[PDB]
Amino acid sequence: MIKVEIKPSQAQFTTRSGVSRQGKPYSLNEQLCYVDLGNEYPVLVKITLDEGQPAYAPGLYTVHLSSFKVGQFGSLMIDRLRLVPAK
């Protein structure tokens, strides 16, 4: 479990439907690169939704280390480029 600090500056959240788009069944809601853990201020870490997750909480959120399928995919890639767990 890792923590992120998705600031409200770009914390837009659009509820995703079952099928928002034939290509992408769920809408994307990415914010910025923020993590509550690192050298000091939010390090550069995005909680890439990757349509596998919705936007959650503005300001502060947590990007699970297991914020991706492990073993089932083998990679934390499912929709697009994803960042490894912050630490």
mmCIF file of N, CA and C in Angstrom:
data_model
loop_
_atom_site.group_PDB
_atom_site.id
_atom_site.type_symbol
_atom_site.label_atom_id
_atom_site.label_comp_id
_atom_site.label_asym_id
_atom_site.label_seq_id
_atom_site.Cartn_x
_atom_site.Cartn_y
_atom_site.Cartn_z
ATOM 1 N N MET A 1 0.847 -1.222 0.000
ATOM 2 C CA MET A 1 0.000 0.000 0.000
ATOM 3 C C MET A 1 0.854 1.232 0.000
ATOM 4 N N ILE A 2 0.643 2.099 -1.009
ATOM 5 C CA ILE A 2 1.405 3.310 -1.118
ATOM 6 C C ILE A 2 0.410 4.427 -1.015
ATOM 7 N N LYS A 3 0.878 5.670 -0.780
ATOM 8 C CA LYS A 3 -0.040 6.773 -0.647
ATOM 9 C C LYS A 3 0.254 7.777 -1.729
ATOM 10 N N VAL A 4 -0.805 8.463 -2.225
ATOM 11 C CA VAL A 4 -0.627 9.463 -3.250
ATOM 12 C C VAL A 4 -1.291 10.718 -2.779
ATOM 13 N N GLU A 5 -0.926 11.855 -3.386
ATOM 14 C CA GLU A 5 -1.488 13.109 -2.958
ATOM 15 C C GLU A 5 -2.001 13.808 -4.176
ATOM 16 N N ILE A 6 -3.014 13.213 -4.838
ATOM 17 C CA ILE A 6 -3.535 13.806 -6.038
ATOM 18 C C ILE A 6 -4.206 15.109 -5.681
ATOM 19 N N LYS A 7 -3.542 16.237 -6.015
ATOM 20 C CA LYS A 7 -4.058 17.541 -5.672
ATOM 21 C C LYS A 7 -5.318 17.811 -6.452
ATOM 22 N N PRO A 8 -6.166 18.633 -5.863
ATOM 23 C CA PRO A 8 -7.438 19.024 -6.456
ATOM 24 C C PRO A 8 -7.278 19.880 -7.665
ATOM 25 N N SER A 9 -6.032 20.323 -7.913
ATOM 26 C CA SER A 9 -5.739 21.180 -9.029
ATOM 27 C C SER A 9 -6.194 20.513 -10.293
ATOM 28 N N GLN A 10 -5.984 19.187 -10.398
ATOM 29 C CA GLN A 10 -6.397 18.486 -11.584
ATOM 30 C C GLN A 10 -7.185 17.288 -11.150
ATOM 31 N N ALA A 11 -7.836 17.371 -9.964
ATOM 32 C CA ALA A 11 -8.597 16.248 -9.476
ATOM 33 C C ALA A 11 -9.973 16.316 -10.048
ATOM 34 N N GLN A 12 -10.095 15.970 -11.340
ATOM 35 C CA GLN A 12 -11.379 15.958 -11.968
ATOM 36 C C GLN A 12 -11.846 14.543 -11.864
ATOM 37 N N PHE A 13 -13.139 14.338 -11.557
ATOM 38 C CA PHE A 13 -13.630 12.997 -11.430
ATOM 39 C C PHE A 13 -14.928 12.906 -12.156
ATOM 40 N N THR A 14 -14.957 12.039 -13.180
ATOM 41 C CA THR A 14 -16.157 11.822 -13.930
ATOM 42 C C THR A 14 -16.523 10.402 -13.655
ATOM 43 N N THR A 15 -17.772 10.170 -13.195
ATOM 44 C CA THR A 15 -18.212 8.827 -12.894
ATOM 45 C C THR A 15 -18.126 8.039 -14.170
ATOM 46 N N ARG A 16 -17.608 6.800 -14.080
ATOM 47 C CA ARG A 16 -17.440 5.989 -15.256
ATOM 48 C C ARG A 16 -18.638 5.091 -15.368
ATOM 49 N N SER A 17 -19.044 4.786 -16.621
ATOM 50 C CA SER A 17 -20.180 3.925 -16.846
ATOM 51 C C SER A 17 -19.631 2.586 -17.246
ATOM 52 N N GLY A 18 -20.520 1.579 -17.433
ATOM 53 C CA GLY A 18 -20.066 0.256 -17.813
ATOM 54 C C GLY A 18 -19.382 0.350 -19.144
ATOM 55 N N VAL A 19 -20.017 1.048 -20.100
ATOM 56 C CA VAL A 19 -19.406 1.214 -21.381
ATOM 57 C C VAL A 19 -19.487 2.670 -21.676
ATOM 58 N N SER A 20 -18.341 3.353 -21.561
ATOM 59 C CA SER A 20 -18.294 4.758 -21.842
ATOM 60 C C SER A 20 -17.916 4.875 -23.279
ATOM 61 N N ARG A 21 -17.083 3.923 -23.726
ATOM 62 C CA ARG A 21 -16.619 3.914 -25.073
ATOM 63 C C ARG A 21 -16.365 2.477 -25.419
ATOM 64 N N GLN A 22 -16.616 2.088 -26.683
ATOM 65 C CA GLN A 22 -16.396 0.716 -27.081
ATOM 66 C C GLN A 22 -14.932 0.380 -26.905
ATOM 67 N N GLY A 23 -14.025 1.323 -27.264
ATOM 68 C CA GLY A 23 -12.605 1.070 -27.129
ATOM 69 C C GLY A 23 -12.235 1.064 -25.673
ATOM 70 N N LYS A 24 -12.718 2.067 -24.909
ATOM 71 C CA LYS A 24 -12.412 2.131 -23.499
ATOM 72 C C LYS A 24 -13.712 2.075 -22.759
ATOM 73 N N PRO A 25 -13.983 0.959 -22.120
ATOM 74 C CA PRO A 25 -15.229 0.787 -21.386
ATOM 75 C C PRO A 25 -15.388 1.735 -20.236
ATOM 76 N N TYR A 26 -14.271 2.246 -19.681
ATOM 77 C CA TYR A 26 -14.376 3.143 -18.559
ATOM 78 C C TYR A 26 -13.619 4.399 -18.894
ATOM 79 N N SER A 27 -14.141 5.556 -18.416
ATOM 80 C CA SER A 27 -13.510 6.835 -18.675
ATOM 81 C C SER A 27 -12.251 6.931 -17.858
ATOM 82 N N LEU A 28 -11.306 7.784 -18.314
ATOM 83 C CA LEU A 28 -10.052 7.941 -17.617
ATOM 84 C C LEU A 28 -10.102 9.210 -16.824
ATOM 85 N N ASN A 29 -9.534 9.162 -15.597
ATOM 86 C CA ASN A 29 -9.507 10.324 -14.751
ATOM 87 C C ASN A 29 -8.175 10.354 -14.064
ATOM 88 N N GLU A 30 -7.134 10.845 -14.761
ATOM 89 C CA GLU A 30 -5.823 10.914 -14.162
ATOM 90 C C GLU A 30 -5.677 12.295 -13.602
ATOM 91 N N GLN A 31 -4.778 12.468 -12.607
ATOM 92 C CA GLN A 31 -4.633 13.764 -11.995
ATOM 93 C C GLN A 31 -3.260 14.300 -12.242
ATOM 94 N N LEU A 32 -2.318 13.971 -11.342
ATOM 95 C CA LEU A 32 -0.986 14.486 -11.464
ATOM 96 C C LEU A 32 -0.053 13.496 -10.835
ATOM 97 N N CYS A 33 1.236 13.879 -10.727
ATOM 98 C CA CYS A 33 2.229 13.007 -10.159
ATOM 99 C C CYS A 33 2.423 13.421 -8.722
ATOM 100 N N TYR A 34 1.867 12.631 -7.770
ATOM 101 C CA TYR A 34 1.960 12.978 -6.373
ATOM 102 C C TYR A 34 2.007 11.738 -5.523
ATOM 103 N N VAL A 35 2.912 11.717 -4.506
ATOM 104 C CA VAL A 35 2.978 10.588 -3.600
ATOM 105 C C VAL A 35 3.298 11.095 -2.235
ATOM 106 N N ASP A 36 2.624 10.537 -1.204
ATOM 107 C CA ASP A 36 2.893 10.955 0.149
ATOM 108 C C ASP A 36 3.938 10.018 0.675
ATOM 109 N N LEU A 37 5.211 10.265 0.286
ATOM 110 C CA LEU A 37 6.306 9.422 0.707
ATOM 111 C C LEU A 37 7.435 9.696 -0.228
ATOM 112 N N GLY A 38 8.649 9.967 0.295
ATOM 113 C CA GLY A 38 9.739 10.199 -0.605
ATOM 114 C C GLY A 38 10.742 11.089 0.033
ATOM 115 N N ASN A 39 11.355 11.947 -0.812
ATOM 116 C CA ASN A 39 12.374 12.851 -0.358
ATOM 117 C C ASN A 39 11.762 13.890 0.537
ATOM 118 N N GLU A 40 10.504 14.307 0.256
ATOM 119 C CA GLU A 40 9.879 15.307 1.087
ATOM 120 C C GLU A 40 8.514 15.605 0.534
ATOM 121 N N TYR A 41 8.434 16.565 -0.422
ATOM 122 C CA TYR A 41 7.164 16.931 -0.999
ATOM 123 C C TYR A 41 6.799 15.819 -1.933
ATOM 124 N N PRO A 42 5.544 15.775 -2.339
ATOM 125 C CA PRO A 42 5.078 14.760 -3.257
ATOM 126 C C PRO A 42 6.044 14.469 -4.360
ATOM 127 N N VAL A 43 6.556 13.228 -4.375
ATOM 128 C CA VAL A 43 7.491 12.835 -5.386
ATOM 129 C C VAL A 43 6.701 12.663 -6.648
ATOM 130 N N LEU A 44 7.378 12.386 -7.771
ATOM 131 C CA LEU A 44 6.679 12.278 -9.022
ATOM 132 C C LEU A 44 6.118 10.883 -9.152
ATOM 133 N N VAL A 45 4.800 10.727 -8.848
ATOM 134 C CA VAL A 45 4.154 9.436 -8.960
ATOM 135 C C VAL A 45 2.698 9.662 -9.272
ATOM 136 N N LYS A 46 2.234 9.074 -10.394
ATOM 137 C CA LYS A 46 0.861 9.224 -10.792
ATOM 138 C C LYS A 46 0.116 7.990 -10.407
ATOM 139 N N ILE A 47 -1.148 8.190 -10.011
ATOM 140 C CA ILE A 47 -2.016 7.097 -9.687
ATOM 141 C C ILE A 47 -2.797 6.934 -10.972
ATOM 142 N N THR A 48 -2.111 6.345 -11.992
ATOM 143 C CA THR A 48 -2.713 6.178 -13.295
ATOM 144 C C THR A 48 -3.906 5.319 -13.121
ATOM 145 N N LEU A 49 -5.059 5.829 -13.561
ATOM 146 C CA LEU A 49 -6.260 5.089 -13.404
ATOM 147 C C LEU A 49 -6.227 3.909 -14.328
ATOM 148 N N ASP A 50 -5.811 4.133 -15.587
ATOM 149 C CA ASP A 50 -5.710 3.053 -16.534
ATOM 150 C C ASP A 50 -7.048 2.360 -16.700
ATOM 151 N N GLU A 51 -8.163 3.123 -16.577
ATOM 152 C CA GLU A 51 -9.522 2.595 -16.741
ATOM 153 C C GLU A 51 -9.779 1.389 -15.863
ATOM 154 N N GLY A 52 -8.835 1.026 -14.972
ATOM 155 C CA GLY A 52 -9.042 -0.112 -14.114
ATOM 156 C C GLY A 52 -9.445 0.417 -12.783
ATOM 157 N N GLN A 53 -9.489 1.757 -12.665
ATOM 158 C CA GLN A 53 -9.851 2.358 -11.421
ATOM 159 C C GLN A 53 -10.340 3.749 -11.706
ATOM 160 N N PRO A 54 -11.241 4.214 -10.870
ATOM 161 C CA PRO A 54 -11.803 5.551 -10.957
ATOM 162 C C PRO A 54 -11.043 6.547 -10.133
ATOM 163 N N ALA A 55 -11.354 7.860 -10.278
ATOM 164 C CA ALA A 55 -10.696 8.844 -9.450
ATOM 165 C C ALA A 55 -11.281 8.621 -8.082
ATOM 166 N N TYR A 56 -10.515 8.878 -6.994
ATOM 167 C CA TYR A 56 -11.039 8.543 -5.687
ATOM 168 C C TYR A 56 -11.197 9.735 -4.785
ATOM 169 N N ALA A 57 -10.087 10.347 -4.342
ATOM 170 C CA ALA A 57 -10.217 11.436 -3.415
ATOM 171 C C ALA A 57 -9.280 12.520 -3.817
ATOM 172 N N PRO A 58 -9.792 13.722 -3.888
ATOM 173 C CA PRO A 58 -8.978 14.865 -4.216
ATOM 174 C C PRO A 58 -8.140 15.277 -3.057
ATOM 175 N N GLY A 59 -6.911 15.703 -3.344
ATOM 176 C CA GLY A 59 -6.022 16.122 -2.309
ATOM 177 C C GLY A 59 -5.193 14.944 -1.918
ATOM 178 N N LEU A 60 -5.818 13.952 -1.243
ATOM 179 C CA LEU A 60 -5.072 12.813 -0.771
ATOM 180 C C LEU A 60 -5.775 11.549 -1.171
ATOM 181 N N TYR A 61 -4.982 10.561 -1.633
ATOM 182 C CA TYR A 61 -5.520 9.282 -2.015
ATOM 183 C C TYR A 61 -4.410 8.284 -1.764
ATOM 184 N N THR A 62 -4.619 6.989 -2.022
ATOM 185 C CA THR A 62 -3.544 6.066 -1.822
ATOM 186 C C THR A 62 -3.461 5.216 -3.049
ATOM 187 N N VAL A 63 -2.233 5.005 -3.566
ATOM 188 C CA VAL A 63 -2.075 4.178 -4.731
ATOM 189 C C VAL A 63 -1.551 2.897 -4.186
ATOM 190 N N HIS A 64 -2.403 1.873 -4.210
ATOM 191 C CA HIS A 64 -2.038 0.597 -3.671
ATOM 192 C C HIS A 64 -0.823 0.104 -4.402
ATOM 193 N N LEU A 65 0.078 -0.629 -3.708
ATOM 194 C CA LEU A 65 1.225 -1.155 -4.402
ATOM 195 C C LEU A 65 0.656 -2.186 -5.321
ATOM 196 N N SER A 66 -0.416 -2.833 -4.832
ATOM 197 C CA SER A 66 -1.119 -3.821 -5.579
ATOM 198 C C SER A 66 -2.216 -3.124 -6.347
ATOM 199 N N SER A 67 -1.928 -1.906 -6.874
ATOM 200 C CA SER A 67 -2.921 -1.149 -7.622
ATOM 201 C C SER A 67 -2.974 -1.701 -9.011
ATOM 202 N N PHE A 68 -2.546 -2.950 -9.166
ATOM 203 C CA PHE A 68 -2.532 -3.553 -10.445
ATOM 204 C C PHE A 68 -2.586 -5.027 -10.224
ATOM 205 N N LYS A 69 -2.919 -5.785 -11.294
ATOM 206 C CA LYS A 69 -3.015 -7.218 -11.179
ATOM 207 C C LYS A 69 -1.618 -7.767 -11.159
ATOM 208 N N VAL A 70 -1.314 -8.612 -10.151
ATOM 209 C CA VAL A 70 0.011 -9.171 -10.035
ATOM 210 C C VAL A 70 -0.083 -10.639 -10.322
ATOM 211 N N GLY A 71 0.738 -11.130 -11.280
ATOM 212 C CA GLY A 71 0.742 -12.541 -11.595
ATOM 213 C C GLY A 71 -0.245 -12.810 -12.686
ATOM 214 N N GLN A 72 -1.464 -12.241 -12.570
ATOM 215 C CA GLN A 72 -2.482 -12.465 -13.572
ATOM 216 C C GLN A 72 -2.018 -11.868 -14.872
ATOM 217 N N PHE A 73 -1.399 -10.670 -14.810
ATOM 218 C CA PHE A 73 -0.912 -10.039 -16.011
ATOM 219 C C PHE A 73 0.578 -10.227 -16.028
ATOM 220 N N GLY A 74 1.222 -10.045 -14.852
ATOM 221 C CA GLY A 74 2.655 -10.209 -14.754
ATOM 222 C C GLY A 74 3.281 -8.852 -14.829
ATOM 223 N N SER A 75 2.521 -7.866 -15.337
ATOM 224 C CA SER A 75 3.022 -6.522 -15.444
ATOM 225 C C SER A 75 1.965 -5.632 -14.875
ATOM 226 N N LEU A 76 2.356 -4.418 -14.438
ATOM 227 C CA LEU A 76 1.393 -3.499 -13.880
ATOM 228 C C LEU A 76 0.803 -2.700 -15.010
ATOM 229 N N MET A 77 0.889 -3.238 -16.246
ATOM 230 C CA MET A 77 0.355 -2.556 -17.394
ATOM 231 C C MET A 77 -0.935 -3.222 -17.742
ATOM 232 N N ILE A 78 -1.978 -2.410 -18.000
ATOM 233 C CA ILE A 78 -3.258 -2.966 -18.341
ATOM 234 C C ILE A 78 -3.911 -2.053 -19.340
ATOM 235 N N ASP A 79 -3.777 -0.719 -19.154
ATOM 236 C CA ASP A 79 -4.394 0.207 -20.072
ATOM 237 C C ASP A 79 -3.316 0.966 -20.781
ATOM 238 N N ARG A 80 -2.392 1.572 -20.017
ATOM 239 C CA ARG A 80 -1.347 2.335 -20.628
ATOM 240 C C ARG A 80 -0.151 2.230 -19.727
ATOM 241 N N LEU A 81 0.758 3.227 -19.783
ATOM 242 C CA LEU A 81 1.938 3.187 -18.958
ATOM 243 C C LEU A 81 1.528 3.455 -17.538
ATOM 244 N N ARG A 82 2.041 2.622 -16.611
ATOM 245 C CA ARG A 82 1.732 2.777 -15.217
ATOM 246 C C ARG A 82 3.036 2.858 -14.489
ATOM 247 N N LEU A 83 3.023 3.527 -13.322
ATOM 248 C CA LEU A 83 4.225 3.694 -12.551
ATOM 249 C C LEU A 83 4.254 2.645 -11.481
ATOM 250 N N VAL A 84 5.479 2.196 -11.130
ATOM 251 C CA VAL A 84 5.644 1.194 -10.106
ATOM 252 C C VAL A 84 5.328 1.840 -8.781
ATOM 253 N N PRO A 85 4.988 1.025 -7.800
ATOM 254 C CA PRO A 85 4.646 1.517 -6.466
ATOM 255 C C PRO A 85 5.685 2.441 -5.896
ATOM 256 N N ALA A 86 5.217 3.569 -5.319
ATOM 257 C CA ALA A 86 6.112 4.549 -4.755
ATOM 258 C C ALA A 86 6.705 3.989 -3.489
ATOM 259 N N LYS A 87 7.972 4.350 -3.204
ATOM 260 C CA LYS A 87 8.611 3.869 -2.004
ATOM 261 C C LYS A 87 9.927 4.636 -1.833
#
